[PDB]
Amino acid sequence: NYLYRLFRKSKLKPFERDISTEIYQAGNRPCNGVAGPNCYSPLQSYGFR
Amino acid sequence: GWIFGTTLDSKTQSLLIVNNATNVVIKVCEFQFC
């Protein structure tokens, strides 16, 4: 139930929140909402045991 | 008023003022304008 962000186009300002979940584009191939080989989901869940 | 923000689907500020009951709603939600 707890998530964190790995990929972002730039850094953050001091005290800035980010809500929008857009698919990251790591290369020249566009994603267009489809997580392909160069497109990754930006929110990965914590694993707590 | 002014509607400060970026990439107008996510976040974005909204300063509607002069309600004639003198109110300064500066609500910051997610909006879709126009």
Side-chain angles (χ1 to χ4, degrees), chain A residues 3-8 19-26 31 33-46:
Chain A
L3 312 158
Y4 77 121
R5 192 175 304 275
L6 281 81
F7 309 107
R8 186 174 157 82
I19 301 297
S20 71
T21 78
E22 311 295 315
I23 318 290
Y24 189 62
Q25 188 198 326
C31 300
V34 178
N38 73 304
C39 305
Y40 292 164
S41 192
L43 293 197
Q44 163 84 330
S45 176
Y46 291 164

Side-chain angles (χ1 to χ4, degrees), chain B residues 5-32:
Chain B
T6 181
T7 309
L8 277 297
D9 181 74
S10 56
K11 304 310 279 295
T12 62
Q13 197 187 10
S14 177
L15 278 79
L16 276 73
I17 192 167
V18 194
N19 205 8
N20 272 345
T22 75
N23 293 115
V24 191
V25 177
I26 302 173
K27 213 190 302 183
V28 168
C29 295
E30 271 156 331
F31 306 111
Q32 184 78 42

Side-chain angles (χ1 to χ4, degrees), chain A residues 7-32:
Chain A
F7 309 107
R8 186 174 157 82
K9 299 291 180 68
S10 179
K11 306 270 205 263
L12 277 189
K13 305 291 97 173
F15 284 135
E16 162 172 16
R17 193 193 283 102
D18 206 351
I19 301 297
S20 71
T21 78
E22 311 295 315
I23 318 290
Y24 189 62
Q25 188 198 326
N28 302 120
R29 289 179 183 268
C31 300
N32 320 108

